[PDB]
Design an enzyme around this catalytic site. Structure first.
Site, PDB file in Angstrom:
ATOM      1  N   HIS A   6      -7.647   2.245   3.993  1.00 38.35           N
ATOM      2  CA  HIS A   6      -7.801   0.992   4.703  1.00 38.35           C
ATOM      3  C   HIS A   6      -9.222   0.987   5.287  1.00 38.35           C
ATOM      4  O   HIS A   6      -9.809   2.032   5.543  1.00 38.35           O
ATOM      5  CB  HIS A   6      -6.772   1.068   5.890  1.00 38.35           C
ATOM      6  N   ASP A  15      -5.112   9.086   9.154  1.00 40.76           N
ATOM      7  CA  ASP A  15      -4.777   7.691   9.522  1.00 40.76           C
ATOM      8  C   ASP A  15      -3.277   7.571   9.331  1.00 40.76           C
ATOM      9  O   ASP A  15      -2.768   7.538   8.174  1.00 40.76           O
ATOM     10  CB  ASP A  15      -5.644   6.735   8.715  1.00 40.76           C
ATOM     11  N   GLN A  74       0.574   3.869   9.004  1.00 43.47           N
ATOM     12  CA  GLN A  74       1.702   3.380   8.203  1.00 43.47           C
ATOM     13  C   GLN A  74       2.775   4.478   8.009  1.00 43.47           C
ATOM     14  O   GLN A  74       3.878   4.185   7.535  1.00 43.47           O
ATOM     15  CB  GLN A  74       1.164   2.931   6.835  1.00 43.47           C
ATOM     16  N   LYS A 134       2.849  -1.533  14.844  1.00 43.94           N
ATOM     17  CA  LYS A 134       3.572  -1.372  13.569  1.00 43.94           C
ATOM     18  C   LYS A 134       4.888  -0.592  13.728  1.00 43.94           C
ATOM     19  O   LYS A 134       5.626  -0.518  12.731  1.00 43.94           O
ATOM     20  CB  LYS A 134       2.677  -0.534  12.625  1.00 43.94           C
ATOM     21  N   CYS A 139      -7.010  -5.294   3.624  1.00 43.50           N
ATOM     22  CA  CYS A 139      -8.026  -4.449   4.244  1.00 43.50           C
ATOM     23  C   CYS A 139      -8.316  -3.234   3.343  1.00 43.50           C
ATOM     24  O   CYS A 139      -8.574  -2.123   3.867  1.00 43.50           O
ATOM     25  CB  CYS A 139      -7.595  -3.963   5.660  1.00 43.50           C
TER      26      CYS A 139
END
Lengths: 405, 405
Positions: free
Chosen positions: A121, A198, A201, A224, A361
């Site tokens: 991303h 990261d 998600q 999220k 993104c």
């Protein structure tokens, strides 16, 4: 894990759009919130809002204990050793920028490499582009396999003894790929690098254990994972945080302020300048309590079921391409042959169905996929197979409609 | 302006602490929220939460219109020319750090001066200390008059043709002083400098008009002006923002992302990386609607009344020192002779009364005042003269109590 009883706690699901029951399949862009989280913000502003870390008065003490209480909940939730390693920020994007500013900019020289992947991303691309430009270091890309996974031999090839940072997503928000972080962290450390993960998600959808992963830094976003907007976390190993300078400066993060020079608080408060995100971080602690009560392994098993069902029902459609691997997180990014994904998303919204269309993104990834844009349906703990039937029936009707047109 | 009807909208005021009705006099640390703001967050998370700036689906469009809608409300509220000049941030502290990083670090060389004052809050000290160290520039202090005001001749003396930045608070959170910003901006511009205004303590309490003030940058925090925590604004003149580089990088603030290079969105989105503070910024728009409905001039006239009443009733007490000038915003910072301010604040909390004790994030000012700490009672639109009577009666009893002890 009863999906009727879970959906009953999310007021927003119970409404119609364009005359059809809402079918919300865009939780990879942002998730919806249960009453436990919304009523935690209400109870904060209704009963004990005050500024934190004075505790001279009663409401102040209660707000402080709420805020630092939620810090401990996040420590336990990702299995960090200490609250000193848990910094509250505005989101994953700010957390990765803090590492790029305070860690990378201070530890890169000409010759040094930062290694990322093509599926990242933008939040986990652009800070690194900037840090390497500032320092004269080099940026490299790990290549992908044809199904959009990463091979560890490609990792071993790309990462060298001049690598100082490997940065990679835990789970891809486009391909649904779950990356082999724990083995990538070994490869980084063997080369003398740190790994920055990261986790935006992965954290909402599967259990995280930073001691098992052995990541040096791990970033996540509240919005999220059923929590309030505007808040996230940066985890870093304490010995790295201790040697990094603050990314922002002000009240709350100082110990002594002279006219020209100041000294900093200990961790974690060294990295939290100004009045903190008090209500949001207490609501993110409530989201963690909510998810832990359901069980992250239960939510991962539900998403596995929904993703296996979706991939099978998408294979039933003619003229539909799905990107990425069979084993995946709870999302499907796709295109209809000869229909622009934006028009797909527009038509689905007329049938009540919310999905995303665009680059997600991930412009370098779209380029790798040889497409300019895609559509994405994503799933979470409140979604059902009946909603997946509605999506596949709508794509079938969209296909027929643009055919007639 | 009816204070009974205003207090009826703030649920948190209606409770007891230690067996006594709450008397909350700490709004300079953070303010309380009316039901209009709390129910705006509820309605967002209950009905139209989604990610913003896609608008491919119905809830997405409603969240976007809410978020950019609130941007326009802030533009109108401070009389900015354009929404391009209104950037949402996490708070005044982050806004001033953005100016120090993106403006100061790019425009300071050896020889250049940044000029501040001794009364500044740390948020408007430490970023400048850091920016001058990074660039080899010099930091200077405007001296104060004996009543803690700033004279314009001292401004004219301190600011020279080597000054590039003057940074100053609109209103002091300790002295209550209202600084002559508009005339200081003239002095800055005459010398070729910009002026950066820390408006955290003015915006909640008096009308702001950035075109009349002619400030180059102006920073404010939602949590002090009946709005949610975790959100603030940075206003800057469009021509300065256009030439500044982003402070943080990611999705949302890009236009094109290549493997090594990216280009930025136009303003304001150039300065808003990652998923924004969606609910908080919509709640800050609701706070602005609430305050505008009451009328900022009405709230300033109420605070003037309460501050004149407090200063008079404090003069009735023996052995009590008040710091700063007679003409002031709605707060009184003070000490009792021979009682530590922390013990003052502890005893008052036993009588229900919430005040602050410490340095108030102004260590250089405490040093100037020749004290190590002070106590501060601060007032807002929901406070009354009866609550000021309770404070002065409690200080009298505290005085007698430590006397007997």
């Amino acid at each position: 894990m009863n999906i009727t009883d879970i959906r009953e706690q999310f007021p927003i699901l119970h409404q119609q759009v364009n005359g059809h029951d809402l079918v919300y399949l865009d939780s990879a862009a942002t998730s919806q919130k249960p009453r436990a989280v919304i009523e935690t913000l209400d109870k904060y502003y209704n009963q004990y809002n005050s500024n934190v870390h004075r505790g001279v008065h009663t409401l102040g003490t209660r707000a402080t204990d709420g805020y630092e209480g939620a810090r401990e909940k996040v420590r336990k939730f990702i299995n960090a050793k200490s609250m000193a390693e848990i910094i509250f920020t505005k989101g994953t994007t700010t957390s990765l920028n803090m590492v790029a500013l305070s860690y990378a900019r201070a530890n890169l020289k000409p010759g040094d490499e930062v290694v990322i992947t093509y599926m990242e991303h933008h939040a986990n691309i652009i800070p690194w582009q900037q840090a390497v430009k500032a320092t004269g270091a080099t940026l490299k890309y790990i290549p992908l396999q044809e199904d959009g996974t990463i091979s560890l031999e490609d990792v071993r090839e790309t990462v060298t003894s001049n690598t100082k940072i490997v940065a990679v997503s835990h789970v891809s928000n486009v391909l649904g790929t779950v990356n082999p972080i724990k083995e990538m962290a070994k490869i980084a450390h063997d080369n003398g690098a740190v790994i920055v993960v990261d986790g935006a998600q992965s954290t909402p959808h599967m259990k995280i254990d930073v001691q098992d992963l052995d990541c040096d830094f791990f970033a996540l976003s509240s919005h999220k994972m059923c929590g309030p907007t505007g808040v996230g976390v940066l985890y870093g190993k304490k010995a790295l945080l201790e040697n990094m300078e603050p990314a922002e400066f002000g009240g709350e993060m100082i110990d002594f302020v002279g006219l020209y020079e100041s000294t900093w608080k200990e961790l974690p408060w060294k990295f939290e300048a100004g009045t903190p995100i008090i209500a949001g971080a207490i609501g993110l602690g409530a989201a963690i309590d909510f998810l832990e009560e359901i069980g992250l392994d239960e939510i991962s098993r539900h998403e596995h079921k929904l993703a296996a069902y979706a991939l099978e029902r998408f294979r039933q459609l003619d003229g539909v391409t799905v990107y990425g691997p069979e084993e995946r997180a709870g999302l499907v990014t796709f295109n209809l042959d000869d229909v622009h994904p934006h028009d797909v998303a527009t038509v689905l919204d007329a049938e009540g169905i919310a999905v995303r269309a665009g680059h997600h993104c991930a412009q370098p990834l779209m380029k790798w996929l040889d497409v300019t844009a895609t559509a994405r349906a994503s799933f979470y703990l409140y979604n059902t197979e009946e909603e997946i039937d509605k999506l596949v029936e709508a794509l079938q009707k969209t296909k027929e409609y643009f055919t007639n047109v």
